[PDB]
Amino acid sequence: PILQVQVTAGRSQQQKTAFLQNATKVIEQTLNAALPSIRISLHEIEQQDSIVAGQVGAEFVNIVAFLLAGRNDEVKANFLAAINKTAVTTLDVSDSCIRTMLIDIAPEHMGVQEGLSAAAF
Amino acid sequence: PILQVQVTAGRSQQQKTAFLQNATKVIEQTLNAALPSIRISLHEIEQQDSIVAGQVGAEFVNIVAFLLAGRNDEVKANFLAAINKTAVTTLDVSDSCIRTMLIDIAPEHMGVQEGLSAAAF
Amino acid sequence: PILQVQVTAGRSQQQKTAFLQNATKVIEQTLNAALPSIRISLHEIEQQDSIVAGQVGAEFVNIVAFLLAGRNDEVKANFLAAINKTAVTTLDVSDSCIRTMLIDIAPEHMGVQEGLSAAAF
């Protein structure tokens, strides 16, 4: 499951390092995808370049997760809980402010190694 | 509805400030989501880091909007019109160059407060 | 089909220029969308701001492609192959490390020129 993440700006590397590290380790820990399938990208966002509720500058994370369809409401429900857990622990933010977004892609619609669709595996 | 936005780079803050402000106010004004549900993130893009039609460096906006499924073609159709309106007014761009992308997420597939899926509310 | 792209950081412009140029030319070359419909945005990502497999700093690309639904598994399958081809040729990376993500949007859910949904055309 490749992941892209927006966090409110202003963290040390190891925050935005260890977070990606146990984000990977939690993406394995969240069934399927050994390792080579997962990636995670962090892209910090400036205050006065974001708004939570209606207050510009409000700390935030949104995870968009692209996974290969065929997975269960409850394993997905499990991703969400452990990944909010990790984001909280190692990004030093609130549980409430992480918006994850689980996007299940079909094997013919993900272009992977060699540009052969994921289906062709 | 959390929002992520790519605009061609080169604006003053208040442009890329007031735009987010009435983008929020228009996201309320566009039925459902009181406030705490909405967020908006702006991420400006350099010329020669984007292309509209086939001409590198061409002013542009693309809004990706993540909303909770269950909403109507016409309220969505309403988002699009007022949000192109706002993007135009306060980002100082053309109507034609904003590409919005309405993505309706299911309540079990959005991880929100506490990492409990949105369904569990 | 508007495109957003994350590449591992560290390329010259013309890499991240010509890539967008034949990415456009290949998006035409991949049936439908004359030109004014396509856009492509590149957003480079720092090492220690990304992870492929579980190794922070690993060169990578992910293309998210937003296209208007109604297109065939095999033309999409064609996008993937030529666009991995182009990404490889002109971004100087491996075939295996590009993750594309084909997202087919419905004509009423894409807000385009004038903020009139794409359906209304």
Give the three-state DSSP class for B40. Answer: strand
Which segments of chain B does DSSP mark as H helices, in order?
15-28, 73-91
Give the separation between CA C30 and CA A32, rounded to whole angstroms: 33
By CB atoms closer than 10 A (0-12, 13-18, 19+), residue C52 is buried
**Residues in chain B within 8 Å Cβ distance of A56:** 17, 20-21
For residue A13, report the phi and psi dihedrals to the nearest 5 degrees: -55, -50
Quoted resolution (Å): 2.1
Q: Solving technique for this entry?
A: X-ray
Residue C4 sits at the vertex; the CA angle it makes with A78 and C36, to the nearest 5 degrees, is 140
Give the separation between CA A35 and CA B120, rounded to whole angstroms: 30
Give the separation between CA B16 and CA A43, rounded to whole angstroms: 18
Which secondary-structure segment (H or E) carries A67? strand A61-68
To the nearest whole angstrom, how far is the Cα of A120 from the nearest Cα of chain B? 26
Determine the residue of chain C that is closest to A7 in CA distance. C49
**Residues in chain B within 8 Å Cβ distance of A104:** 109
The one-letter code for the residue type at B120 is A
Q: Report yes or no: C42 and C23 within 8 Å, Cβ to Cβ.
A: no
Give the separation between CA A119 and CA A113, rounded to whole angstroms: 12
Q: Report yes or no: C104 and C73 within 8 Å, Cβ to Cβ.
A: no
Backbone φ/ψ region at C84: left (φ over 0), alpha (ψ -120 to 50), beta: alpha
| Chain A residues within 8 angstroms (CB to CB) of chain B | 6, 43, 45, 48-54, 56, 58, 60, 62-64, 73, 76-77, 79-85, 95-96, 98-104
CB contact under 8 A, A84 and B115: yes
Q: Report yes or no: B65 and B101 within 8 Å, Cβ to Cβ.
A: yes
Q: Report yes or no: B76 and C108 within 8 Å, Cβ to Cβ.
A: yes
**Residues in chain B within 8 Å Cβ distance of C39:** 50-53, 58, 60, 62, 99
How far lies A52's CA from each of A61, A90, A98, B26, C108, in Å?
Answer: 10, 20, 10, 14, 27
| Chain A residues within 8 angstroms (CB to CB) of chain C | 2, 4, 13, 16-17, 20-21, 23-25, 28, 35-36, 38-43, 66, 105, 108-117
Beta bridge partners of A103: A66
